[PDB]
Design a protein around this ligand. Structure first.
Ligand SMILES: CCCCCCCC[n+]1ccn(CC(O)(P(=O)([O-])O)P(=O)(O)O)c1
Ligand SMILES: CCCCCCCC[n+]1ccn(CC(O)(P(=O)([O-])O)P(=O)(O)O)c1
Ligand SMILES: [Mg+2]
Ligand SMILES: [Mg+2]
Ligand SMILES: [Mg+2]
Ligand SMILES: [Mg+2]
Lengths: 333, 333
């Protein structure tokens, strides 16, 4: 369902770019095209695809005219632009090397900290497109506010992610703190935002229905981030497209949280000695310790429980939305 | 006029902060307060003061109730928040040392590239305040769009500023290119944005009146930036609150543009040899060359001409707005 729509979705990118690209600003405009091609393409498009898939499922085919669809995939691309924005900036703050199987944009020769302006340009495009295509829709302001509220929450999440991981400083790494981080940093924008966008486009804007969708989608977001933490250490970089940094960057990863919960006092010291340091020998020691306490299998356990819990939540809260809206998304993770 | 209102304006900051500051996000919220106190305070408040001053002058005192005023100084602070946002980020991209008489936020021990998330948080506050105080006004969407359009233009301006100044690369430094840079990078947000904000709050939203105000305000913006370039080299850092970087960072400064226009072929080589390099000896050689061609006096000449031109423009385009709106601003620069 996602898999079949992916093609139409990716083709519509060329138009996004033509519409986004005053002879005086020529060069700046050419640099925008380059920023977009490099940073908006190459991912799985889960998030933007979710807008289009959920739109199809919530609007009657008789209301799905050609113009109506154009807008659904534009808002789909706005969500991808948000993602591209957050990624370019997070890679600098995380000192990451690769993203989506290539060098991070800031690590390119001749880019560096200019990437900061590039990232924000990507964010400015969302609102240019919203104006271009939705300025006369009755949901226009709802969408604008949704995308803004979603950036604020996710920047709040980052702050928490950064404050909990000072460079060159474990008591801090609790369950309560972790859940809080992943809720703000990932769950609102990766999960609530795309479904809610499609809800407002389908004329569904009751508070109750948004909160019920939210209940489902925040929990899916939390699982997704825990998966992200797992793959940071135990995923194949040939598949993920990115090299992990979590132990080096002293992060409140799900892995470190579970570990702590499990560790003999001596094991606690091994972690204390080695965590949050750039030395490959010390990172390997931490990885060995995670393997010593079967955290890959604890992760496979958690993944199953949480999937059951998400399914229970869909059964409780999907009505009156088609459950397929949610099942389709959960199956893709 | 600016000078008397400055006090009420700065006091209202405490409320901005209380209103901006979910027990789980506590720490993130405390970090926001810190970001605000450090980065929103310490400047001249020209831009936010302009909102309040122009508001007073365009609304009848009978429509200036207490609530009406609260909103004018909130939007005033939104413009200052935009400024604080742009500054925190520009200091990183410019590798600057001080701002407003203290260490740049990113150069503080324990901050560094986290400053990227801090800056964007400052931008998120604008829209939180807009919702808090103006969500029921008929100008609400006009203001939202104005602040967004103004960030896009100013990020476009940055791109141009950065593309024209590659690290470790003069033919590029033309008049046409310079005017273009300063129009986007400074003129929309520092000059058009605050007056237009107050126009929309006073119910004045005709296209013609906005364009006429724009004609005046873009030219004031251009002069202001040329002044900014001059003070970067020939200003007292005890007064400016900031150390210059323009020659080091290989910038299309007004100074370098004029110089080029004036230089013997041999002088052109001295500039080529020394420009855009971190070496203090080479920066001093460029400064000596600017003094050799009396650019401080050329600047004092240009300042006078341009002031005449701005005054001619007010005489042509102020109607039906009070000319004092513009004169007050021009006198403060
Ligand atoms: C401008 C302020 C916006 C900052 C954007 C924060 C978005 C939250 N977020 C979720 C995931 N990622 C990417 C990761 O780096 P990973 O994709 O594993 O690289 P992470 O683990 O740091 O969370 C970022
Ligand atoms: C996130 C993308 C937003 C980037 C913000 C660009 C704002 C334009 N602008 C105007 C003035 N400054 C400050 C200077 O550094 P100066 O105050 O002399 O330091 P500049 O000379 O570089 O122009 C910045
Ligand atoms: Mg991160
Ligand atoms: Mg990660
Ligand atoms: Mg700059
Ligand atoms: Mg300057």
């Amino acid at each position: 369902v996602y898999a079949q729509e992916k093609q139409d979705f990716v083709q519509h990118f060329s138009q996004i770019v033509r519409v986004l690209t005053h002879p005086e600003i020529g060069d700046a405009i050419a640099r925008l095209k380059e920023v977009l091609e490099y940073n908006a393409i190459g991912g799985k498009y889960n998030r933007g695809l979710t807008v289009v898939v959920a739109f199809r499922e919530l609007v009657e085919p008789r209301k799905q005219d050609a113009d109506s669809l154009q807008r659904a995939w534009t808002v789909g691309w706005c969500v991808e632009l948000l993602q591209a924005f957050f990624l370019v900036a997070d890679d600098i703050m995380d000192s990451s090397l690769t993203r989506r199987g290539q060098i991070c944009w800031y690590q390119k020769p001749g880019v560096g900290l200019d990437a900061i302006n590039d990232a924000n340009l990507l964010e400015a495009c969302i609102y240019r497109l919203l104006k271009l295509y939705c300025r006369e829709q009755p949901y226009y302001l709802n969408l604008i506010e949704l995308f803004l509220q979603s950036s604020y929450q996710t920047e709040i999440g980052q702050t928490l992610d950064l404050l909990t991981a000072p460079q060159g400083n474990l008591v801090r790494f609790t369950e309560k703190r972790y859940k809080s981080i992943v809720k703000y940093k990932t769950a609102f924008y990766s999960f609530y935002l795309p479904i809610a966008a499609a809800m407002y486009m389908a004329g569904i804007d009751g508070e109750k229905e948004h909160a019920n969708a939210k209940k489902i989608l925040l929990e899916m977001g939390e699982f997704f981030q825990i998966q992200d933490d797992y793959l940071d250490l135990f995923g194949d970089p040939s598949v993920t497209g990115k090299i992990g940094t979590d132990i080096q960057d002293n992060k409140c990863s799900w892995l470190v949280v579970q570990c702590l919960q499990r560790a003999t006092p001596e094991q606690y010291q091994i972690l204390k000695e080695n965590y949050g340091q750039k030395e490959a020998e010390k990172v390997a020691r931490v990885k060995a310790l995670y393997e010593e306490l079967d955290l890959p299998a604890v992760f496979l356990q958690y993944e199953e429980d949480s999937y059951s819990h998400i399914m229970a939540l869909i059964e409780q809260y999907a009505a009156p939305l088609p459950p397929a809206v949610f099942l389709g998304l959960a199956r893709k993770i």
